[PDB]
Every structure is written in C-alpha cells, then in structure tokens.
C-alpha cells in the first residue's frame, strides 16, 4: 500500500499502545502486531495491525534490530510522527 505519515499524541504516563514484532535480525521490518484498545495508537486512528513502521520522528527503523527499535520507539514523547506502510 501507500506509505503514510501518521501523527500520534501520547501523554507521559502512557505507552504507545502497540505490540511490535520483527526486526532486522529476522529479515523483516518492525511490524505492528497489536493495537491495544483505547491506548494512544488506537486513539490516533491511523495505525493498524500489519503496518510496518518505517520511521518514527525521522529516525529510520527500516534496518533496525528488534530491541534497537524498542529503545527508539519508547524514547519518543508527546506528538510523535510515524512513517508506516501496509503490505
């Protein structure tokens, strides 16, 4: 599908509200496997199970290992821009 830019708004007491799988060491992108109901990713409306997370806040995640992506993603605060694609 088309590459999309998606904005997510998160408070500091919350996580992103997604489960991710995959990563470079497995030869696949960082993939959203769950959107947890009522949490920030669900509320933002534009992120979905099956989306590959290509970048967050301009940080490329295409070639990132799983735990690298966890560190990068969990570091982001407030208004967070995602670049995603559903294949």
């Amino acid at each position: 599908g088309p590459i999309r830019k998606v904005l997510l708004l998160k408070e500091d007491h919350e996580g992103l509200g997604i489960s991710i799988t995959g990563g470079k060491e497995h030869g696949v992108p960082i993939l959203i496997s769950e959107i947890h109901p009522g949490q920030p990713a669900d509320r933002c409306g534009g992120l979905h199970v099956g989306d590959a997370i290509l970048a967050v806040n301009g940080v490329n995640l295409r070639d990132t290992k799983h735990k690298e992506a966890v560190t990068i993603l969990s570091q982001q605060r407030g208004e967070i821009e995602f670049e995603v694609v559903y294949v």
């Binding site: 996580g15 799988t21 696949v28 769950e34």
Partner: peptide, 7 residues
C-alpha cells in the same frame, strides 16, 4: 520465530 514487545 520472532519476538514481540509491547510498547
């Protein structure tokens, strides 16, 4: 298989 993290 691949790991999953909740974030």
């Amino acid at each position: 298989r691949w790991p999953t993290s909740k974030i």
